Subunit: 151 residues, 2 copies
């Protein structure tokens, strides 16, 4: 099943956790690396925290985020980069990416999370009047997750 | 806020419509200014029970393509537009600020389509045997009527 990595972190009014699991076969296939050419599926689980100031109830998935990453193989310095895509699976939506790793050893996953105002595939608005408005979007946050990959 | 017509069970979702006063939004240039509008029109789209696209009952369904056609039935004036996804203090919704055509009876058609699933896709579907979900719903149309007081 899924392997949690690092520790969940409270940032920008959300709880940001990371896991990996087997590569996930995707439709359309061209959205991301094919599962058959990958080692793992990396996943960010991002939910609203209590007293989120952007209109999301505690435990809600936060959609339209821009989630990017740097994955470093600490044993030799190799860095691979990309974006997590939003997607739905049978346990709900998440942000993830199929990746080919660099062999067993110690890895550092660094996530960069920006609010929906930064999405350049899909515009997303925020109410700002007194009656229906919410607080300003969080400024971009980063979170790190270190783990040992076995194969 | 004033409910429009009745919620409808379509495509594995509950699709309701409401209007309220015009809303100020950021980025403001992406929606009709509140001062130039009569109402904010809102589509409330939530997953129903036993949803086949991975959503729990009551979840907001994101990344949909939602458009509308409004007809002032008194005089036949037709108006078309798109909703944009946005968040307000009661959560996310699909909305648009609209200038109407005066008091009277209106017909609202909501066109709800799934996320793109081709080379333009944002939002993917898992399809393997451990994590996969069913196919996206076929596009649906929901019809409502209401009387606008002015």
């Amino acid at each position: 099943k899924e392997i949690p990595i690092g520790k969940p972190q409270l940032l920008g009014g959300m709880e940001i956790a990371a896991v990996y699991l087997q590569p996930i076969e995707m439709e359309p296939e061209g959205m991301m690396r094919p599962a058959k050419d990958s080692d793992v599926h990396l996943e960010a689980d991002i939910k609203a925290a209590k007293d989120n100031t952007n209109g999301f109830a505690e435990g809600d998935w936060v959609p339209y985020l821009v989630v990017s990453y740097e994955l470093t193989h600490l044993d030799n310095g190799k860095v691979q980069k990309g974006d997590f895509m939003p997607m739905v699976a049978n346990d709900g939506p998440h942000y993830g990416d199929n990746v080919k790793l660099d062999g067993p050893g110690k890895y550092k996953l660094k996530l960069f999370v920006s609010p929906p105002s930064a999405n350049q595939h899909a515009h997303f608005g925020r109410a700002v009047d007194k009656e229906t408005g919410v607080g300003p979007w969080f400024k971009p946050v980063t979170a790190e997750y270190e783990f040992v990959y076995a194969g």
